[PDB]
Amino acid sequence: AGGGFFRGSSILVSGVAGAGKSSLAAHFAAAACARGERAMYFSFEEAADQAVRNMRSLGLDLGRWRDAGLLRFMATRPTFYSLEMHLAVILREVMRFEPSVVV
Amino acid sequence: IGDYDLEGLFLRLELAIDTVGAKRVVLDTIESLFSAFSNPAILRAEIRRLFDWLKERGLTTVITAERGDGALTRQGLEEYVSDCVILLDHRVENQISTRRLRIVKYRGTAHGTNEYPFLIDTDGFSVLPVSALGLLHQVHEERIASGVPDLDAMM
Amino acid sequence: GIGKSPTGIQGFDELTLGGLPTGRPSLVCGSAGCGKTLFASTFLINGVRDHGEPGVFVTFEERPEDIVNNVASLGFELDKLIEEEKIAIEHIAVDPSEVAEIGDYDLEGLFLRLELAIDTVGAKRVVLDTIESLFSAFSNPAILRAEIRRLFDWLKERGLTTVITAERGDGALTRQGLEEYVSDCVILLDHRVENQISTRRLRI
Amino acid sequence: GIGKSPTGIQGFDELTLGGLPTGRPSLVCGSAGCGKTLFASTFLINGVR
Numbered sequence A: 001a002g003g004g005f006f007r008g009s010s011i012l013v014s015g016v017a018g019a020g021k022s023s024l025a026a027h028f029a030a031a032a033c034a035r036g037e038r039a040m041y042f043s044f045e046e047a048a049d050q051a052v053r054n055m056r057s058l059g060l061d062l063g064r065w066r067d068a069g070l071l072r073f074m075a076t077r078p079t080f081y082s083l084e085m086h087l088a089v090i091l092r093e094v095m096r097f098e099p100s101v102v103v
Numbered sequence B: 001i002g003d004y005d006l007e008g009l010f011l012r013l014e015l016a017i018d019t020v021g022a023k024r025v026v027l028d029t030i031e032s033l034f035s036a037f038s039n040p041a042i043l044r045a046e047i048r049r050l051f052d053w054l055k056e057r058g059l060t061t062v063i064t065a066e067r068g069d070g071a072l073t074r075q076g077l078e079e080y081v082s083d084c085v086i087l088l089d090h091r092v093e094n095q096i097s098t099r100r101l102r103i104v105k106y107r108g109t110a111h112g113t114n115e116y117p118f119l120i121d122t123d124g125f126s127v128l129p130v131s132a133l134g135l136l137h138q139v140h141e142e143r144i145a146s147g148v149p150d151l152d153a154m155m
Numbered sequence C: 001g002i003g004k005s006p007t008g009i010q011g012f013d014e015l016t017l018g019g020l021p022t023g024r025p026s027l028v029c030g031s032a033g034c035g036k037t038l039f040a041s042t043f044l045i046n047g048v049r050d051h052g053e054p055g056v057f058v059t060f061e062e063r064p065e066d067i068v069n070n071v072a073s074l075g076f077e078l079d080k081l082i083e084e085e086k087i088a089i090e091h092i093a094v095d096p097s098e099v100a101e102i103g104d105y106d107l108e109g110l111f112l113r114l115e116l117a118i119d120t121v122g123a124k125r126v127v128l129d130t131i132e133s134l135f136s137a138f139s140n141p142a143i144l145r146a147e148i149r150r151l152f153d154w155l156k157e158r159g160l161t162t163v164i165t166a167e168r169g170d171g172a173l174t175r176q177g178l179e180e181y182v183s184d185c186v187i188l189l190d191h192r193v194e195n196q197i198s199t200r201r202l203r204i
Numbered sequence D: 001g002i003g004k005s006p007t008g009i010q011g012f013d014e015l016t017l018g019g020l021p022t023g024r025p026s027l028v029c030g031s032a033g034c035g036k037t038l039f040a041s042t043f044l045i046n047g048v049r
């Protein structure tokens, strides 16, 4: 009812591997960018070029939005930082870009 | 304590350095000289004297220290005087021994702070840290055949 | 209640509800590499920058240039502040004979010097770093506690916000086990390894 | 920041962001057989080479 989730809400997408979790998140981000807003998508298991190629088959164009300066796609393994510095980097980056949707 | 004339040692070390025009130095088994000192304050003063003399020359120095029964050093004072402290460890778990490395202190910059297993092998020390692995690959558009033509038809 | 001095580490001021005590010494304890020197350096630098409080860094071990360089990469223009006459680094060296026994050092002599240093910059914050050199000599528990109390009382009389860096050694908080019972604020910095991952931790 | 001297052990230079400090002593601590002598030998030999 009303056309979707509330704006500042917290949404959890759950499922088994291959379910479509990444595709739904990318659809969220791509729509957010398509409305002219800004999105940040933090992936911890796939690379940027690989994620772009994978989403391209589903008809999304995440590259258009990266090249337009409306989607920041950040990829880092969980072992690259300590739990404190992961949080620090995420918060700093979110601050600077001032996103509307963070995944 | 004070039995050894450290200035005498300083004279000699100078001779050795000027022979080859050294820019790197290793002091190995300084425990022989400093295990004698049996008052905590006097020992720390002598260690500071030696370290200050080394720092004055501008010589990149590595000092090997023995853990003994201590966390880092037997006498427990050298780790509070140096600027870089590196601990090497060899622990046994379930009958398997692992060489590990750690940078306990390094004043002046950022560095790794975890324990990094390493290997002494035919060519020397080898460290392949897991924190250096990123996610920056390159992607290709060709495909690889499986040798099962039926399975390839499923894709 | 009591007055407090902000450290500039937002998030430690929130925990302390304002900062470290004003006019009383504080003890920062840790092992090697735990950051208890960067804590004092940050205290002094943030005090001078955000509140116009000249500071003094008394060191019994390290040289002033080493202290200046140890924080250069963090962005602190410590050389600037030293040039501008807003921070003073004082080196009080001790020779092997000097530190032999109890009462060997004339603490009043030290008090005279520290006074000189404070009146140079008109300090309102002070850091005493590596006082272990002087007090590791004392080998009777009572005499050592009396001397530590003497020093702390002298510091408290002046109304100077002081931070004292202490080495854990093999102890829970301090090597000799007495300074934590004389100060009013005790902060422990810890660096523990679990499953090969090291974590910096802080506790009041 | 500070100058550094490469040790020649690639993977320890990466962790240290250049190597051991130039112009300052460094302490390598370990029990018997932990390799703290091979570390110094490698430091010297790689430096000269």
Ligand SMILES: Nc1ncnc2c1ncn2[C@@H]1O[C@H](COP(=O)(O)OP(=O)(O)OP(=O)(O)O)[C@@H](O)[C@H]1O
Pocket: A015, A016, A017, A018, A019, A020, A021, A022, A023, A024, A057, A058
């Ligand atoms: N062009 C396409 N046509 C039909 N189905 C596709 C197409 N592209 C991808 N799919 C399906 O989309 C799915 C994507 O799965 P997705 O990665 O989004 O789920 P996941 O929960 O994130 O998995 P992971 O464990 O890798 O994170 C693929 O398994 C694939 O089966």
Ligand SMILES: Nc1ncnc2c1ncn2[C@@H]1O[C@H](COP(=O)(O)OP(=O)(O)O)[C@@H](O)[C@H]1O
Pocket: B104, B105, B106, B107, B108, B109, B110, B111, C030, C031, C032, C033, C034, C035, C036, C037, C038, C039, C070, C073, C074
């Ligand atoms: N620029 C920096 N970035 C991240 N960490 C740093 C930086 N500079 C210093 N550090 C930390 O400073 C630590 C040393 O702490 P320090 O306070 O100088 O000595 P101590 O704790 O023995 O008194 C080092 O272990 C190092 O990790």
Ligand SMILES: Nc1ncnc2c1ncn2[C@@H]1O[C@H](COP(=O)(O)OP(=O)(O)O)[C@@H](O)[C@H]1O
Pocket: B120, B121, B122, D030, D031, D032, D033, D034, D035, D036, D037, D038, D039
């Ligand atoms: N050619 C080699 N190949 C693999 N390991 C070696 C080789 N040579 C020495 N080692 C290691 O060197 C270790 C001794 O370390 P060393 O630095 O010489 O003494 P210490 O650690 O007490 O200072 C031995 O335990 C051995 O495992």
Ligand SMILES: [Mg+2]
Pocket: A021, A022
């Ligand atoms: Mg996925």
Ligand SMILES: [Mg+2]
Pocket: C036, C037
């Ligand atoms: Mg220190």
Ligand SMILES: [Mg+2]
Pocket: D036, D037
């Ligand atoms: Mg050896």
